[PDB]
Structure 1
Amino acid sequence: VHHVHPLPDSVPESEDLFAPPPRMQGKEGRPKPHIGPNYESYVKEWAKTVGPNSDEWWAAKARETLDWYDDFKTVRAGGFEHGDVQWFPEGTLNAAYNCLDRHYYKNPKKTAIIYEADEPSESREVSYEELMQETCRVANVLKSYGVKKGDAVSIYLPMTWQAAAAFLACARIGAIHSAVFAGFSAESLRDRVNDCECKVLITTDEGRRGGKTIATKQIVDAALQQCPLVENVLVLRRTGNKVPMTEGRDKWWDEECAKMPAYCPCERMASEDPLFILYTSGSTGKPKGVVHSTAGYLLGTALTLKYVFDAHPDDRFACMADIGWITGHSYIIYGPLANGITTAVFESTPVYPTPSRYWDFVDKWKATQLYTAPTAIRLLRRMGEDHVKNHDLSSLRVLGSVGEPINPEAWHWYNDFAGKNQCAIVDTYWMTETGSISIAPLPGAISTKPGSATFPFFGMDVDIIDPQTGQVLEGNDVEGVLVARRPWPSIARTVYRDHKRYLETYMKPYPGYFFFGDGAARDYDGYMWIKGRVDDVINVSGHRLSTAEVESALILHKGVAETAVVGCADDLTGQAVYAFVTMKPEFDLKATKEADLSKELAIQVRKVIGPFAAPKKIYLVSDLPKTRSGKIMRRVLRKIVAGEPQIVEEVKQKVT
């Protein structure tokens, strides 16, 4: 008799609640959790971070977490309506000083970065001394190019450890870095280079990902022909293969840095000075250049890492994402290094050289936390349990998931093999615009449900609004759109040179609130469930269906690897459901007739969700359209099913 149901799972609801395991109880010599041991301990602290008397907690956390050059006087000001959000405005600091120097001064030999190379034998540890010295050399090179405080600098680097040095070198001198996924086309790179109006670009000669070569310098050359403002290009010699170099414009990273000293002073940045620009992926439309300031963002990534992953000084955090993504910004570089711990820069893929790469990595360095996306979790689950069953992995305590709703079926595989039912699973929900994790379980306090992000993080006061009325739905067992009531420190301050798009997208749909764009429900116990994008909702005869419902129901069928449902106009039901299903490679499509597989899928969905939710048509594909981030581009499939990289050719053909 609950209007809000959990995501479909093979495990019954009465046996599907997972309390913090002994590794997250301070047992076996593991570190004691910062928040624990139950839900009330989370609320007792969270209540200090929201409301009209939360300034005391935030002012204390800001001064305790970051090193300041000048103290602040005001804690917060501004709001959503005009986009004038301010946090600690009178304070001065530097991100590079907090992520490097202050930890170098205490323990220079401590490992800052575990550089897991594409080839495993080429991996090595990078100390804080080496990362700070290389950062200061690059900062000295940029200053010799005439880069000033507030100038934009484009970054087009793959997942090599020097990418963090390029990030922090810009932050050290007050330049706004704008990282772009290594592998984006010359057209995509050009649009982001021209939009930020940078005069300097940093890239490599070539990149190496999963035994493949990214011709980064060749792509830069093609883009820069239509980028008339770039005057200086710094090229890192990653592979050593012959690439074109333009005289005067292009210089070698190693030859420039060798001329510069190994220390560079820190520019004293105001709290609201812009730290970086990051362009979104654009799963729903044209990407926007999200701008984050300094103090609020840095404090948010520092606190979230410490509490969402229960990080302790000697931990080795392993976020396997790419720094072209906000996950890499906040939980590879800024978050982990601000806390002064060891972070991982993973250059390869989850299946190179073999699908055991994640776990050969975990046992080699004894990683204490793992952070990845559901697309990689569903990829390793598809390759069999024989790449995971015979590893140790006991060094881990917390496993993370970010980017999309994680199906309970994929949640359990993560829980059973990567954690061996001894790790806590943090389903972390947030956006590029939020800066830091918005809704996630605190691993030493929250009992988890497969597919639920649980409860909002410190400083986040979220509510559910009925989109039909624009009113907040009070209580539990409610469903609607997710919004936030007040600003938080790490919130995006603007969209670069397009503040109107920033207010129209996030601040004007529901005035007084921040609009995430996601559908959400709060069950009877108060747990939040992110149902999917509001744009991706399908309305069949007045039944509003989310993507996470049907896809989680479809994956409950044997052999199903990954699915994606989109809507299309129907004359009887208003909209009809179309399913794109990917089976495991070992599945026999000849012994099992396809028409009977579709019928079994339609009954599997009807038995878990309802009669209305059965897909009207089901297409079998080899893969789905996905961004470099890993998100499924359901907007593309919807247009194909309506008539309007290489996987798009297989989808358009099979749709006719």
Structure 2
Amino acid sequence: RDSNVVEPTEANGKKSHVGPHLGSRMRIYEYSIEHNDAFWAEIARRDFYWKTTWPDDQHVKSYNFDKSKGPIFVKWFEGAVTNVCYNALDRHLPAHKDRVCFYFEGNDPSVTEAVTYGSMYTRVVELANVLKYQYGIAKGDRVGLYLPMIPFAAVAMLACARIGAVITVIFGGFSAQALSSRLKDAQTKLLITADASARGTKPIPLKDVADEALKECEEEGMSIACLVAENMSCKMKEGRDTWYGDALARLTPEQHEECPVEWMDAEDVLFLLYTSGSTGKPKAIVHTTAGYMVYASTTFMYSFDYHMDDVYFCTADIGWITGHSYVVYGPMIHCATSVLFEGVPNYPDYSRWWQLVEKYKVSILYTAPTAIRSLMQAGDDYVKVGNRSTLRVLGSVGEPINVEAWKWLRDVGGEGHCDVSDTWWQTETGGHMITPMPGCTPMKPGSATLPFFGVQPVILDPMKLHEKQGPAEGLLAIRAPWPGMARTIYGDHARFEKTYFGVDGYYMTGDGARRDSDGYYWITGRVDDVLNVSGHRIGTSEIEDAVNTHPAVVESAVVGFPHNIKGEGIYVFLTFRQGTEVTPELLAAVKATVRKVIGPLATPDVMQVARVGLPKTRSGKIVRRILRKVSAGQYTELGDTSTLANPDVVEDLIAEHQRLCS
């Protein structure tokens, strides 16, 4: 056995749904691959409600991964009928009406509410009836959500699922321009938002931002209604904007108690989630109903070993896939009791998440390496004042975790009595794909370990594009379908086939990985050109285009660079027009332009002025390798300069970088 292996705790072994040692997991995994249809049919029948089941347990999937045979497609549970809201809520009643669904706390610690499953039912039937009868939302209509992490956010997702509407969630940190682009592309009929929120000391205007987005949408010929939850005096446009309290007042008494369920076919769309690509504008990843429901919920259960006596806390936002699968849908479908937190880990101070852990007796904590590294920098006293005795599983998602952060998470945060589930997956996969399972999986810090049940990863040789056996490094791909796979890109199946199915027979993840002699996977990062910043994808061209809209800017080039907290940061090289007075204020104005066009999440970390221009070939192409190496401080590895039309720029780029140090 490797010396870096960490054994699962004995207590987690005894509690595990799977078993106390690796053989228990491998027995199920083998069955889940060789009897793949029967496995998922048994899971689906065991753990979910179906109005109508699929016709044949031996054939719950049909698919084509080989473009030479025809269009790429995937279907799971075709013929079955179900509803995600019913599985998240109604079926838990009346037996669990008094069970807490969310222990909610606001940014302000004096704002708290324990929301039971019974109360969620009431809230969801009310909102669903508002949507049906006051907004005329019908099956398949698109509804945009621009909401903070408050109970109404989950209510809104589940109410739309209840009636068969398609949600598209826009992260609350996007700007108005980013919000409007998503509403226009999805052709939303309705925007659900809130008056405002707060994050630390920062006010978060939501309806004020939505006002600017809706004005742009109207200029484009759209008519989008807006429903505003009361979270914290807004301007309300007569005829377009309604306070949720006024909408509630229009309900009849029985509309507070009953709302018919729209029974959905298996491949009906559930949500669109706009995701940045290596090239081009963000595209909406499409997830349908039955396969996603099954996959998000089953991975929730096994990857975290969730039992009914556990209390769960995921720190992710609903604006991202982790918040879809592992705050709202997956946890509620398995009747989890969860912490729902509107705020940030450092307000009032850096003990906040630990205050939540101890107050609600959290036993499973799912967070991200950027956040962990921030907690590490703040100092261990903020952690050690908290009682962490209830923690038994800690999870990490979104980006690689290095050994030091992994060890700190387990041995400081979790006091050495936790297993750690480093879950590798992506927006397109619906749920966890490679992950430890508590109690049964020996862990290697920095490795995602073994594939989830029903998942067959492969390592493809980058040059020959065929599978490599045994220990190997190359392109991470998946050789067979799983229930949670995204079904298309909204309005662009051609781009979906091009991006993910360029090698016939495989789903191409866009990640590189190494598989070791124990079959454990080590994800080494994106092999395309998209950035993964604080755990979320952003494309360089989006940031460049935004930077270039500043009137003084001639040209820009954006690269990622290693960042000790965010993993990968945003480094901008740019040129200004002749005669520009370059000042700190001007650089701040260019940064503010990015923040207006995209949002704070896209704030450049470093802005370097290329006094003499960007390195370009004689054909005018920017030589990005040079900028990548400079931004990382790797001056000895710039590589070839002989194709540069302007080789005198290199000396300046290095000297300016050293002055900034970056």
Task: Give the alignment's TM-score, normalised by structure 2.
Answer: 0.79
Name the residue aligned to 2:266.
271
Aligned counterpart for 1:441 among listed residues 431, 436, 439: 436
- 1:381 corresponds to which letter in structure 2? M
Question: Within 5 A, what are the aligned runs for 1:229-240?
Answer: 229-239=222-232
Name the residue aligned to 1:253.
244
Aligned counterpart for 1:406 among listed residues 393, 397, 401: 401
CA distance, structure 2, for counterparts of residue 469 and residue 233 of structure 1: 52
1:478 aligns with 2:463: no
CA distance, structure 1, for counterparts of residue 270 and residue 169 of structure 2: 12
CA distance, structure 2, for counterparts of residue 398 and residue 177 of structure 1: 31
RMSD: 3.0
Aligned counterpart for 1:111 among listed residues 94, 97, 100: 100
2:481 match: secondary structure: coil
Aligned counterpart for 2:493 among listed residues 496, 499, 502: 499
CA distance, structure 2, for counterparts of residue 111 and residue 210 of structure 1: 26
Q: Which runs of 5+ in 1 are unaligned?
A: 1-12, 27-31, 539-545, 549-576, 585-624, 645-649
CA distance, structure 1, for counterparts of residue 151 and residue 659 of structure 2: 41
Deviation, structure 1 residue 532: 0.7
Name the residue aligned to 1:72.
54
* Equivalent pair of 2:287/2:487 in contact (CA under 8 Å): yes
Distance change >3 Å, CA 395–CA 630, structure 1 → 2: farther
CA distance, structure 2, for counterparts of residue 58 and residue 334 of structure 1: 18
CA distance, structure 1, for counterparts of residue 7 and residue 93 of structure 2: 38
2:344 match: secondary structure: coil
CA distance, structure 1, for counterparts of residue 214 and residue 603 of structure 2: 30
Distance change >3 Å, CA 42–CA 202, structure 1 → 2: same
Distance change >3 Å, CA 66–CA 382, structure 1 → 2: same
* Equivalent pair of 1:333/1:343 in contact (CA under 8 Å): no
1:120 aligns with 2:109: yes
* Equivalent pair of 1:640/1:655 in contact (CA under 8 Å): no
Name the residue aligned to 2:6.
18
CA distance, structure 1, for counterparts of residue 475 and residue 179 of structure 2: 33
- 1:641 corresponds to which letter in structure 2? L
1:641 match: secondary structure: helix
CA distance, structure 2, for counterparts of residue 639 and residue 216 of structure 1: 39
1:277 match: secondary structure: strand
The Cα offsets for residues 578-630 of structure 1, whole Å up to 9 and x where unpaired, read as 9655599xxxxxxxxxxxxxxxxxxxxxxxxxxxxxxxxxxxxxxxx999898
Distance change >3 Å, CA 581–CA 297, structure 1 → 2: closer
Question: Within 5 A, what are the aligned runs for 1:71-470?
Answer: 71-74=53-56, 75-80=60-65, 81=67, 82-144=71-133, 145-228=135-218, 229-239=222-232, 242-260=233-251, 261-262=255-256, 263-282=258-277, 286-470=281-465
Deviation, structure 1 residue 488: 0.5
The Cα offsets for residues 191-241 of structure 1, whole Å up to 9 and x where unpaired, read as 1000110111100011222232111111111111121324310001111xx
* Equivalent pair of 1:181/1:628 in contact (CA under 8 Å): no
Deviation, structure 1 residue 76: 0.8
The Cα offsets for residues 336-356 of structure 1, whole Å up to 9 and x where unpaired, read as 000011122211111111111
1:121 match: secondary structure: coil
Name the residue aligned to 2:636.
none
1:486 match: secondary structure: coil
CA distance, structure 2, for counterparts of residue 500 and residue 251 of structure 1: 39
* Equivalent pair of 2:174/2:600 in contact (CA under 8 Å): no
The Cα offsets for residues 429-481 of structure 1, whole Å up to 9 and x where unpaired, read as 00000001000001111110110000000110110000110110012x21001
Distance change >3 Å, CA 518–CA 580, structure 1 → 2: closer
Name the residue aligned to 1:620.
none
Aligned counterpart for 2:507 among listed residues 496, 503, 514: 514
Deviation, structure 1 residue 535: 2.8
Deviation, structure 1 residue 16: 2.0
CA distance, structure 1, for counterparts of residue 215 and residue 100 of structure 2: 40
CA distance, structure 2, for counterparts of residue 63 and residue 98 of structure 1: 12
Distance change >3 Å, CA 479–CA 583, structure 1 → 2: closer
Aligned counterpart for 1:59 among listed residues 38, 41, 51: 41
* Equivalent pair of 1:205/1:217 in contact (CA under 8 Å): yes
Deviation, structure 1 residue 652: 12
1:37 aligns with 2:20: yes
Distance change >3 Å, CA 281–CA 353, structure 1 → 2: farther
Distance change >3 Å, CA 107–CA 503, structure 1 → 2: same
* Equivalent pair of 1:439/1:457 in contact (CA under 8 Å): yes
CA distance, structure 2, for counterparts of residue 258 and residue 408 of structure 1: 55
Deviation, structure 1 residue 33: 0.6
Q: Percent identity?
A: 44
Deviation, structure 1 residue 184: 0.5
Deviation, structure 1 residue 21: 1.1
Distance change >3 Å, CA 636–CA 151, structure 1 → 2: farther
Name the residue aligned to 2:546.
none
- 1:79 corresponds to which letter in structure 2? N
CA distance, structure 1, for counterparts of residue 657 and residue 128 of structure 2: 46
Question: Within 5 A, what are the aligned runs for 1:643-654?
Answer: 654=660
* Equivalent pair of 2:97/2:116 in contact (CA under 8 Å): yes
The range that moved more, 371-380 or 381-390, is 381-390
* Equivalent pair of 1:375/1:631 in contact (CA under 8 Å): no
Task: Give the alignment's TM-score, normalised by structure 1.
Answer: 0.80
Distance change >3 Å, CA 146–CA 331, structure 1 → 2: same
Aligned counterpart for 2:518 among listed residues 519, 522, 525: 525
Distance change >3 Å, CA 15–CA 655, structure 1 → 2: closer
CA distance, structure 2, for counterparts of residue 19 and residue 395 of structure 1: 19
CA distance, structure 1, for counterparts of residue 448 and residue 604 of structure 2: 22
* Equivalent pair of 1:373/1:630 in contact (CA under 8 Å): no
2:312 match: secondary structure: strand
Deviation, structure 1 residue 106: 1.6
Report how many residues are paired: 554
* Equivalent pair of 2:560/2:628 in contact (CA under 8 Å): no
Name the residue aligned to 2:575.
none
- 1:38 corresponds to which letter in structure 2? H
The range that moved more, 376-385 or 526-535, is 526-535
- 2:209 corresponds to which letter in structure 1? I
CA distance, structure 1, for counterparts of residue 525 and residue 600 of structure 2: 16
